[PDB]
Short mmCIF file of N, CA and C in Angstrom, two decimals:
data_model
loop_
_atom_site.label_atom_id
_atom_site.label_comp_id
_atom_site.label_asym_id
_atom_site.label_seq_id
_atom_site.Cartn_x
_atom_site.Cartn_y
_atom_site.Cartn_z
N UNK A 87 -135.01 -31.74 53.11
CA UNK A 87 -136.40 -31.87 52.70
C UNK A 87 -136.61 -31.39 51.26
N UNK A 88 -137.51 -32.06 50.54
CA UNK A 88 -137.85 -31.66 49.18
C UNK A 88 -138.97 -30.62 49.22
N UNK A 89 -138.99 -29.75 48.21
CA UNK A 89 -140.04 -28.75 48.11
C UNK A 89 -141.30 -29.43 47.58
N UNK A 90 -142.44 -29.33 48.27
CA UNK A 90 -143.68 -29.91 47.74
C UNK A 90 -144.24 -29.11 46.58
N UNK A 91 -145.00 -29.79 45.72
CA UNK A 91 -145.57 -29.13 44.56
C UNK A 91 -146.49 -28.00 44.97
N UNK A 92 -147.23 -28.18 46.06
CA UNK A 92 -148.17 -27.15 46.47
C UNK A 92 -147.46 -25.81 46.71
N UNK A 93 -146.28 -25.85 47.32
CA UNK A 93 -145.54 -24.61 47.55
C UNK A 93 -145.23 -23.91 46.23
N UNK A 94 -144.76 -24.66 45.23
CA UNK A 94 -144.44 -24.06 43.94
C UNK A 94 -145.70 -23.63 43.20
N UNK A 95 -146.80 -24.38 43.34
CA UNK A 95 -148.05 -23.95 42.73
C UNK A 95 -148.48 -22.59 43.27
N UNK A 96 -148.45 -22.41 44.60
CA UNK A 96 -148.86 -21.13 45.18
C UNK A 96 -147.96 -20.00 44.68
N UNK A 97 -146.65 -20.25 44.61
CA UNK A 97 -145.74 -19.25 44.05
C UNK A 97 -146.05 -19.00 42.57
N UNK A 98 -146.31 -20.07 41.82
CA UNK A 98 -146.63 -19.93 40.40
C UNK A 98 -147.86 -19.05 40.22
N UNK A 99 -148.89 -19.29 41.02
CA UNK A 99 -150.14 -18.57 40.83
C UNK A 99 -149.93 -17.11 41.21
N UNK A 100 -149.09 -16.84 42.21
CA UNK A 100 -148.78 -15.45 42.56
C UNK A 100 -148.10 -14.73 41.41
N UNK A 101 -147.22 -15.43 40.68
CA UNK A 101 -146.54 -14.81 39.55
C UNK A 101 -147.49 -14.60 38.38
N UNK A 102 -148.45 -15.51 38.18
CA UNK A 102 -149.49 -15.30 37.18
C UNK A 102 -150.29 -14.05 37.51
N UNK A 103 -150.67 -13.90 38.77
CA UNK A 103 -151.41 -12.71 39.20
C UNK A 103 -150.62 -11.45 38.89
N UNK A 104 -149.32 -11.46 39.18
CA UNK A 104 -148.52 -10.26 38.99
C UNK A 104 -148.32 -9.96 37.50
N UNK A 105 -148.05 -10.99 36.69
CA UNK A 105 -147.85 -10.78 35.26
C UNK A 105 -149.09 -10.21 34.59
N UNK A 106 -150.27 -10.54 35.10
CA UNK A 106 -151.54 -10.06 34.55
C UNK A 106 -152.11 -8.87 35.31
N UNK A 107 -151.33 -8.30 36.23
CA UNK A 107 -151.74 -7.11 36.97
C UNK A 107 -153.10 -7.29 37.63
N UNK A 108 -153.35 -8.48 38.17
CA UNK A 108 -154.63 -8.74 38.82
C UNK A 108 -154.77 -8.22 40.24
N UNK A 109 -153.65 -7.88 40.89
CA UNK A 109 -153.75 -7.31 42.23
C UNK A 109 -154.48 -5.97 42.18
N UNK A 110 -154.20 -5.16 41.17
CA UNK A 110 -154.92 -3.90 41.03
C UNK A 110 -156.40 -4.12 40.72
N UNK A 111 -156.71 -5.16 39.94
CA UNK A 111 -158.10 -5.46 39.64
C UNK A 111 -158.85 -5.88 40.91
N UNK A 112 -158.22 -6.69 41.74
CA UNK A 112 -158.80 -7.12 43.01
C UNK A 112 -158.30 -6.29 44.17
N UNK A 113 -158.43 -4.98 44.01
CA UNK A 113 -158.25 -4.01 45.06
C UNK A 113 -159.61 -3.44 45.45
N UNK A 114 -159.72 -3.04 46.71
CA UNK A 114 -160.91 -2.32 47.15
C UNK A 114 -161.14 -1.10 46.26
N UNK A 115 -160.05 -0.44 45.86
CA UNK A 115 -160.16 0.77 45.04
C UNK A 115 -160.87 0.49 43.72
N UNK A 116 -160.58 -0.65 43.10
CA UNK A 116 -161.15 -0.98 41.80
C UNK A 116 -162.48 -1.73 41.89
N UNK A 117 -162.99 -1.96 43.09
CA UNK A 117 -164.24 -2.70 43.27
C UNK A 117 -165.42 -1.74 43.19
N UNK A 118 -165.75 -1.35 41.96
CA UNK A 118 -166.75 -0.32 41.69
C UNK A 118 -168.10 -0.90 41.29
N UNK A 119 -168.32 -2.19 41.52
CA UNK A 119 -169.57 -2.80 41.13
C UNK A 119 -170.75 -2.27 41.93
N UNK A 120 -171.94 -2.49 41.38
CA UNK A 120 -173.17 -2.07 42.03
C UNK A 120 -173.42 -2.88 43.29
N UNK A 121 -174.13 -2.27 44.24
CA UNK A 121 -174.38 -2.95 45.51
C UNK A 121 -175.34 -4.11 45.29
N UNK A 122 -175.09 -5.22 45.98
CA UNK A 122 -176.01 -6.35 46.04
C UNK A 122 -176.79 -6.34 47.35
N UNK A 123 -176.09 -6.38 48.48
CA UNK A 123 -176.70 -6.24 49.79
C UNK A 123 -176.08 -5.06 50.51
N UNK A 124 -176.84 -3.98 50.68
CA UNK A 124 -176.32 -2.84 51.41
C UNK A 124 -176.02 -3.24 52.86
N UNK A 125 -174.94 -2.74 53.45
CA UNK A 125 -173.98 -1.76 52.95
C UNK A 125 -172.69 -2.34 52.42
N UNK A 126 -172.53 -3.66 52.42
CA UNK A 126 -171.20 -4.23 52.35
C UNK A 126 -170.97 -5.28 51.28
N UNK A 127 -172.00 -5.76 50.59
CA UNK A 127 -171.83 -6.78 49.56
C UNK A 127 -172.06 -6.13 48.20
N UNK A 128 -171.06 -6.22 47.33
CA UNK A 128 -171.13 -5.58 46.03
C UNK A 128 -170.91 -6.61 44.93
N UNK A 129 -171.51 -6.36 43.78
CA UNK A 129 -171.20 -7.16 42.61
C UNK A 129 -169.75 -6.95 42.20
N UNK A 130 -169.10 -8.02 41.76
CA UNK A 130 -167.80 -7.87 41.14
C UNK A 130 -167.91 -7.16 39.79
N UNK A 131 -166.84 -6.45 39.43
CA UNK A 131 -166.78 -5.83 38.12
C UNK A 131 -166.56 -6.91 37.05
N UNK A 132 -166.82 -6.53 35.80
CA UNK A 132 -166.54 -7.44 34.69
C UNK A 132 -165.08 -7.85 34.67
N UNK A 133 -164.18 -6.91 34.97
CA UNK A 133 -162.75 -7.22 34.97
C UNK A 133 -162.40 -8.18 36.10
N UNK A 134 -163.02 -8.01 37.27
CA UNK A 134 -162.78 -8.96 38.35
C UNK A 134 -163.27 -10.35 37.96
N UNK A 135 -164.44 -10.44 37.34
CA UNK A 135 -164.96 -11.75 36.96
C UNK A 135 -164.06 -12.41 35.93
N UNK A 136 -163.65 -11.66 34.91
CA UNK A 136 -162.84 -12.26 33.84
C UNK A 136 -161.46 -12.65 34.34
N UNK A 137 -160.90 -11.87 35.26
CA UNK A 137 -159.63 -12.23 35.87
C UNK A 137 -159.76 -13.53 36.66
N UNK A 138 -160.83 -13.67 37.44
CA UNK A 138 -161.02 -14.88 38.22
C UNK A 138 -161.18 -16.09 37.31
N UNK A 139 -161.93 -15.95 36.21
CA UNK A 139 -162.05 -17.07 35.30
C UNK A 139 -160.70 -17.44 34.70
N UNK A 140 -159.93 -16.43 34.28
CA UNK A 140 -158.62 -16.68 33.69
C UNK A 140 -157.70 -17.40 34.66
N UNK A 141 -157.78 -17.05 35.94
CA UNK A 141 -156.90 -17.65 36.93
C UNK A 141 -157.34 -19.08 37.20
N UNK A 142 -158.64 -19.37 37.16
CA UNK A 142 -159.10 -20.75 37.26
C UNK A 142 -158.65 -21.59 36.07
N UNK A 143 -158.75 -21.04 34.85
CA UNK A 143 -158.28 -21.79 33.69
C UNK A 143 -156.79 -22.09 33.82
N UNK A 144 -156.00 -21.11 34.27
CA UNK A 144 -154.57 -21.31 34.42
C UNK A 144 -154.28 -22.44 35.40
N UNK A 145 -154.97 -22.46 36.54
CA UNK A 145 -154.68 -23.48 37.54
C UNK A 145 -155.11 -24.86 37.06
N UNK A 146 -156.33 -24.98 36.53
CA UNK A 146 -156.84 -26.32 36.26
C UNK A 146 -156.27 -26.91 34.98
N UNK A 147 -156.03 -26.10 33.95
CA UNK A 147 -155.58 -26.68 32.69
C UNK A 147 -154.13 -27.14 32.74
N UNK A 148 -153.28 -26.48 33.54
CA UNK A 148 -151.86 -26.81 33.51
C UNK A 148 -151.60 -28.24 33.95
N UNK A 149 -152.48 -28.82 34.76
CA UNK A 149 -152.29 -30.17 35.27
C UNK A 149 -153.32 -31.16 34.74
N UNK A 150 -154.06 -30.79 33.72
CA UNK A 150 -155.01 -31.72 33.12
C UNK A 150 -154.25 -32.64 32.16
N UNK A 151 -154.29 -33.95 32.36
CA UNK A 151 -153.38 -34.82 31.60
C UNK A 151 -153.72 -34.86 30.12
N UNK A 152 -152.68 -35.09 29.32
CA UNK A 152 -152.79 -34.99 27.87
C UNK A 152 -153.70 -36.05 27.29
N UNK A 153 -153.63 -37.29 27.79
CA UNK A 153 -154.42 -38.35 27.18
C UNK A 153 -155.91 -38.13 27.40
N UNK A 154 -156.30 -37.49 28.50
CA UNK A 154 -157.71 -37.12 28.64
C UNK A 154 -158.06 -35.95 27.73
N UNK A 155 -157.17 -34.97 27.61
CA UNK A 155 -157.52 -33.77 26.85
C UNK A 155 -157.65 -34.06 25.36
N UNK A 156 -156.96 -35.09 24.86
CA UNK A 156 -157.15 -35.50 23.47
C UNK A 156 -158.44 -36.27 23.25
N UNK A 157 -159.11 -36.71 24.32
CA UNK A 157 -160.31 -37.53 24.20
C UNK A 157 -161.56 -36.86 24.72
N UNK A 158 -161.43 -35.77 25.45
CA UNK A 158 -162.57 -35.07 26.04
C UNK A 158 -162.49 -33.63 25.58
N UNK A 159 -163.61 -33.09 25.12
CA UNK A 159 -163.70 -31.67 24.83
C UNK A 159 -163.93 -30.94 26.14
N UNK A 160 -163.02 -30.02 26.49
CA UNK A 160 -163.11 -29.31 27.75
C UNK A 160 -163.77 -27.96 27.52
N UNK A 161 -164.75 -27.65 28.34
CA UNK A 161 -165.54 -26.44 28.20
C UNK A 161 -164.85 -25.30 28.94
N UNK A 162 -165.01 -24.09 28.40
CA UNK A 162 -164.48 -22.91 29.06
C UNK A 162 -165.15 -22.74 30.41
N UNK A 163 -164.34 -22.46 31.43
CA UNK A 163 -164.90 -22.14 32.74
C UNK A 163 -165.69 -20.84 32.61
N UNK A 164 -166.87 -20.80 33.21
CA UNK A 164 -167.72 -19.64 33.02
C UNK A 164 -168.62 -19.46 34.23
N UNK A 165 -169.17 -18.26 34.35
CA UNK A 165 -170.23 -17.98 35.30
C UNK A 165 -171.59 -18.24 34.66
N UNK A 166 -172.52 -18.73 35.47
CA UNK A 166 -173.88 -19.00 35.04
C UNK A 166 -174.80 -18.19 35.94
N UNK A 167 -176.05 -18.04 35.51
CA UNK A 167 -176.99 -17.19 36.23
C UNK A 167 -177.43 -17.83 37.54
N UNK A 168 -177.71 -16.97 38.53
CA UNK A 168 -178.50 -17.36 39.68
C UNK A 168 -177.72 -17.95 40.83
N UNK A 169 -178.49 -18.57 41.73
CA UNK A 169 -177.92 -19.21 42.92
C UNK A 169 -177.10 -18.21 43.73
N UNK A 170 -177.63 -17.01 43.89
CA UNK A 170 -176.93 -15.97 44.65
C UNK A 170 -177.06 -16.27 46.14
N UNK A 171 -175.95 -16.36 46.86
CA UNK A 171 -176.03 -16.64 48.30
C UNK A 171 -176.69 -15.49 49.06
N UNK A 172 -177.24 -15.81 50.22
CA UNK A 172 -177.86 -14.79 51.06
C UNK A 172 -176.79 -14.00 51.79
N UNK A 173 -177.19 -12.90 52.44
CA UNK A 173 -176.25 -12.14 53.26
C UNK A 173 -175.76 -13.03 54.42
N UNK A 174 -176.69 -13.77 55.03
CA UNK A 174 -176.31 -14.69 56.10
C UNK A 174 -175.32 -15.75 55.59
N UNK A 175 -175.53 -16.25 54.36
CA UNK A 175 -174.57 -17.18 53.76
C UNK A 175 -173.18 -16.56 53.69
N UNK A 176 -173.11 -15.36 53.12
CA UNK A 176 -171.84 -14.66 52.95
C UNK A 176 -171.16 -14.44 54.30
N UNK A 177 -171.93 -13.98 55.28
CA UNK A 177 -171.39 -13.75 56.61
C UNK A 177 -170.84 -15.04 57.21
N UNK A 178 -171.59 -16.13 57.08
CA UNK A 178 -171.20 -17.38 57.71
C UNK A 178 -169.93 -17.93 57.10
N UNK A 179 -169.78 -17.77 55.80
CA UNK A 179 -168.67 -18.34 55.06
C UNK A 179 -167.40 -17.52 55.20
N UNK A 180 -167.46 -16.40 55.90
CA UNK A 180 -166.24 -15.62 56.11
C UNK A 180 -165.25 -16.31 57.02
N UNK A 181 -165.58 -17.51 57.52
CA UNK A 181 -164.62 -18.32 58.28
C UNK A 181 -163.34 -18.57 57.50
N UNK A 182 -163.42 -18.46 56.17
CA UNK A 182 -162.28 -18.68 55.30
C UNK A 182 -161.15 -17.71 55.58
N UNK A 183 -161.45 -16.57 56.21
CA UNK A 183 -160.42 -15.59 56.58
C UNK A 183 -159.53 -16.08 57.72
N UNK A 184 -159.95 -17.12 58.45
CA UNK A 184 -159.17 -17.64 59.56
C UNK A 184 -158.06 -18.57 59.11
N UNK A 185 -158.10 -18.98 57.86
CA UNK A 185 -157.22 -20.03 57.36
C UNK A 185 -155.87 -19.46 56.98
N UNK A 186 -154.85 -20.31 57.03
CA UNK A 186 -153.51 -19.90 56.64
C UNK A 186 -153.39 -19.87 55.12
N UNK A 187 -152.52 -18.99 54.63
CA UNK A 187 -152.40 -18.80 53.20
C UNK A 187 -151.99 -20.05 52.46
N UNK A 188 -151.30 -20.97 53.13
CA UNK A 188 -150.82 -22.18 52.48
C UNK A 188 -151.96 -23.13 52.14
N UNK A 189 -153.13 -22.93 52.72
CA UNK A 189 -154.29 -23.75 52.43
C UNK A 189 -154.99 -23.34 51.15
N UNK A 190 -154.48 -22.34 50.44
CA UNK A 190 -155.11 -21.92 49.20
C UNK A 190 -154.95 -22.98 48.12
N UNK A 191 -155.89 -22.96 47.17
CA UNK A 191 -155.87 -23.86 46.03
C UNK A 191 -155.82 -25.33 46.46
N UNK A 192 -156.36 -25.62 47.63
CA UNK A 192 -156.38 -26.96 48.19
C UNK A 192 -157.82 -27.45 48.12
N UNK A 193 -158.09 -28.36 47.19
CA UNK A 193 -159.42 -28.92 47.03
C UNK A 193 -159.86 -29.69 48.27
N UNK A 194 -158.94 -30.00 49.18
CA UNK A 194 -159.29 -30.74 50.38
C UNK A 194 -160.03 -29.95 51.42
N UNK A 195 -160.14 -28.63 51.24
CA UNK A 195 -160.77 -27.82 52.27
C UNK A 195 -162.29 -27.81 52.17
N UNK A 196 -162.87 -28.56 51.24
CA UNK A 196 -164.31 -28.70 51.20
C UNK A 196 -165.01 -27.37 51.00
N UNK A 197 -165.88 -27.02 51.95
CA UNK A 197 -166.63 -25.77 51.83
C UNK A 197 -165.71 -24.56 51.72
N UNK A 198 -164.53 -24.63 52.33
CA UNK A 198 -163.67 -23.47 52.52
C UNK A 198 -162.59 -23.35 51.46
N UNK A 199 -162.73 -24.03 50.32
CA UNK A 199 -161.71 -23.92 49.29
C UNK A 199 -161.62 -22.47 48.86
N UNK A 200 -160.39 -21.97 48.71
CA UNK A 200 -160.19 -20.56 48.40
C UNK A 200 -158.89 -20.33 47.67
N UNK A 201 -158.75 -19.11 47.13
CA UNK A 201 -157.47 -18.62 46.67
C UNK A 201 -157.44 -17.12 46.97
N UNK A 202 -156.24 -16.58 47.10
CA UNK A 202 -156.05 -15.16 47.36
C UNK A 202 -155.59 -14.46 46.10
N UNK A 203 -156.08 -13.24 45.90
CA UNK A 203 -155.73 -12.43 44.74
C UNK A 203 -155.86 -10.98 45.16
N UNK A 204 -154.79 -10.21 45.04
CA UNK A 204 -154.84 -8.82 45.47
C UNK A 204 -155.21 -8.73 46.94
N UNK A 205 -156.23 -7.91 47.23
CA UNK A 205 -156.67 -7.69 48.60
C UNK A 205 -157.80 -8.62 49.04
N UNK A 206 -158.13 -9.64 48.25
CA UNK A 206 -159.32 -10.45 48.48
C UNK A 206 -159.02 -11.93 48.58
N UNK A 207 -159.73 -12.61 49.47
CA UNK A 207 -159.73 -14.06 49.56
C UNK A 207 -161.02 -14.58 48.92
N UNK A 208 -160.89 -15.41 47.90
CA UNK A 208 -162.04 -15.84 47.11
C UNK A 208 -162.41 -17.26 47.51
N UNK A 209 -163.59 -17.43 48.12
CA UNK A 209 -164.13 -18.73 48.50
C UNK A 209 -164.99 -19.27 47.36
N UNK A 210 -164.65 -20.48 46.89
CA UNK A 210 -165.44 -21.22 45.92
C UNK A 210 -166.32 -22.23 46.64
N UNK A 211 -167.44 -21.78 47.14
CA UNK A 211 -168.26 -22.63 48.00
C UNK A 211 -169.03 -23.64 47.16
N UNK A 212 -169.01 -24.92 47.53
CA UNK A 212 -169.71 -25.93 46.72
C UNK A 212 -171.22 -25.74 46.76
N UNK A 213 -171.83 -25.68 45.57
CA UNK A 213 -173.27 -25.62 45.41
C UNK A 213 -173.85 -26.98 45.04
N UNK A 214 -173.47 -27.51 43.88
CA UNK A 214 -173.92 -28.84 43.50
C UNK A 214 -173.04 -29.35 42.37
N UNK A 215 -173.21 -30.64 42.08
CA UNK A 215 -172.59 -31.30 40.94
C UNK A 215 -173.74 -31.70 40.02
N UNK A 216 -173.71 -31.23 38.78
CA UNK A 216 -174.78 -31.56 37.85
C UNK A 216 -174.22 -31.79 36.46
N UNK A 217 -174.76 -32.80 35.78
CA UNK A 217 -174.18 -33.33 34.55
C UNK A 217 -172.70 -33.57 34.86
N UNK A 218 -171.78 -33.08 34.05
CA UNK A 218 -170.39 -33.32 34.33
C UNK A 218 -169.68 -32.09 34.84
N UNK A 219 -170.36 -31.27 35.64
CA UNK A 219 -169.81 -30.00 36.10
C UNK A 219 -169.99 -29.84 37.60
N UNK A 220 -169.02 -29.15 38.20
CA UNK A 220 -169.13 -28.64 39.56
C UNK A 220 -169.63 -27.20 39.48
N UNK A 221 -170.63 -26.87 40.29
CA UNK A 221 -171.07 -25.49 40.45
C UNK A 221 -170.61 -24.99 41.81
N UNK A 222 -170.04 -23.78 41.84
CA UNK A 222 -169.53 -23.20 43.07
C UNK A 222 -169.90 -21.72 43.12
N UNK A 223 -170.33 -21.26 44.30
CA UNK A 223 -170.68 -19.86 44.52
C UNK A 223 -169.43 -19.10 44.96
N UNK A 224 -168.96 -18.19 44.13
CA UNK A 224 -167.69 -17.52 44.39
C UNK A 224 -167.92 -16.16 45.02
N UNK A 225 -167.47 -16.00 46.26
CA UNK A 225 -167.56 -14.75 46.99
C UNK A 225 -166.16 -14.34 47.40
N UNK A 226 -165.81 -13.07 47.19
CA UNK A 226 -164.52 -12.55 47.60
C UNK A 226 -164.65 -11.80 48.92
N UNK A 227 -163.73 -12.06 49.84
CA UNK A 227 -163.68 -11.43 51.16
C UNK A 227 -162.47 -10.52 51.22
N UNK A 228 -162.69 -9.25 51.54
CA UNK A 228 -161.53 -8.38 51.68
C UNK A 228 -160.71 -8.83 52.88
N UNK A 229 -159.40 -9.01 52.67
CA UNK A 229 -158.58 -9.64 53.69
C UNK A 229 -158.31 -8.75 54.89
N UNK A 230 -158.53 -7.44 54.76
CA UNK A 230 -158.49 -6.55 55.91
C UNK A 230 -159.87 -6.06 56.30
N UNK A 231 -160.92 -6.68 55.75
CA UNK A 231 -162.31 -6.34 56.06
C UNK A 231 -162.59 -4.86 55.84
N UNK A 232 -161.95 -4.28 54.83
CA UNK A 232 -162.27 -2.95 54.36
C UNK A 232 -163.47 -3.03 53.42
N UNK A 233 -163.92 -1.89 52.93
CA UNK A 233 -165.08 -1.94 52.04
C UNK A 233 -164.67 -1.54 50.62
N UNK A 234 -165.21 -2.20 49.59
CA UNK A 234 -166.19 -3.30 49.61
C UNK A 234 -165.66 -4.53 50.35
N UNK A 235 -166.41 -4.93 51.37
CA UNK A 235 -166.00 -6.02 52.24
C UNK A 235 -166.18 -7.37 51.57
N UNK A 236 -167.27 -7.51 50.80
CA UNK A 236 -167.64 -8.75 50.15
C UNK A 236 -167.98 -8.46 48.69
N UNK A 237 -167.50 -9.31 47.78
CA UNK A 237 -167.79 -9.21 46.36
C UNK A 237 -168.50 -10.47 45.88
N UNK A 238 -169.64 -10.32 45.22
CA UNK A 238 -170.33 -11.47 44.61
C UNK A 238 -169.82 -11.61 43.18
N UNK A 239 -169.03 -12.65 42.93
CA UNK A 239 -168.47 -12.88 41.61
C UNK A 239 -169.43 -13.67 40.72
N UNK A 240 -170.15 -14.62 41.30
CA UNK A 240 -171.09 -15.42 40.55
C UNK A 240 -170.91 -16.89 40.86
N UNK A 241 -171.88 -17.67 40.38
CA UNK A 241 -171.81 -19.12 40.40
C UNK A 241 -170.98 -19.57 39.21
N UNK A 242 -169.85 -20.17 39.48
CA UNK A 242 -168.96 -20.65 38.43
C UNK A 242 -169.27 -22.10 38.15
N UNK A 243 -169.11 -22.50 36.89
CA UNK A 243 -169.35 -23.87 36.44
C UNK A 243 -168.03 -24.39 35.88
N UNK A 244 -167.51 -25.46 36.50
CA UNK A 244 -166.22 -26.04 36.15
C UNK A 244 -166.42 -27.52 35.84
N UNK A 245 -165.88 -27.96 34.70
CA UNK A 245 -166.01 -29.36 34.31
C UNK A 245 -165.37 -30.27 35.34
N UNK A 246 -166.13 -31.27 35.80
CA UNK A 246 -165.72 -32.05 36.96
C UNK A 246 -164.35 -32.71 36.76
N UNK A 247 -164.04 -33.18 35.55
CA UNK A 247 -162.77 -33.88 35.36
C UNK A 247 -161.59 -32.96 35.67
N UNK A 248 -161.76 -31.65 35.52
CA UNK A 248 -160.68 -30.71 35.81
C UNK A 248 -160.36 -30.69 37.30
N UNK A 249 -161.39 -30.71 38.14
CA UNK A 249 -161.18 -30.73 39.58
C UNK A 249 -160.70 -32.10 40.02
N UNK A 250 -161.32 -33.16 39.49
CA UNK A 250 -160.97 -34.51 39.90
C UNK A 250 -159.48 -34.77 39.70
N UNK A 251 -158.89 -34.18 38.67
CA UNK A 251 -157.50 -34.50 38.35
C UNK A 251 -156.50 -33.82 39.27
N UNK A 252 -156.92 -32.79 40.01
CA UNK A 252 -155.99 -32.10 40.90
C UNK A 252 -155.76 -32.90 42.17
N UNK A 253 -156.79 -33.54 42.68
CA UNK A 253 -156.65 -34.26 43.92
C UNK A 253 -156.71 -33.31 45.09
N UNK A 254 -156.27 -33.81 46.25
CA UNK A 254 -156.37 -33.08 47.51
C UNK A 254 -154.98 -32.82 48.07
N UNK A 255 -154.60 -31.54 48.15
CA UNK A 255 -153.31 -31.19 48.73
C UNK A 255 -153.24 -31.55 50.21
N UNK A 256 -154.38 -31.49 50.91
CA UNK A 256 -154.48 -32.01 52.27
C UNK A 256 -155.76 -32.84 52.40
N UNK A 257 -155.76 -33.72 53.39
CA UNK A 257 -156.78 -34.75 53.50
C UNK A 257 -158.16 -34.18 53.84
#
């Protein structure tokens, strides 16, 4: 059997995390942000947010084809204000913890698209598509349900062509 690209992508992203020491950033110990919903939902730190953005840029840009990138100006992935999910939203979306690790970075998972970093599983929940961007509400779930149990990272805005080009690792 041949090794699928998804397997190497997941390994690649794990090595990116390690080279940038992001496991320590996404530890319960380093999750010192202010509370959003007492007792268990906290704001992500600036370092957690910037690490998450950097990891999204790493994943999406590496496979963005050259002929498009010479013809389209690609915007930096960033967080935008607002669209904060409710506590009930966060609770309901914790279904992402039931999924196997191999389903990470798989755009085919719809609502449950996620990636793991350090002690947290980060769900990029679809909010809307507007102009040429995807908006997603990013919440981190502690994988052992320790506290901080939930981290609100923000609504991320990603240029649609970046997601479109990855395709679906599963149907």
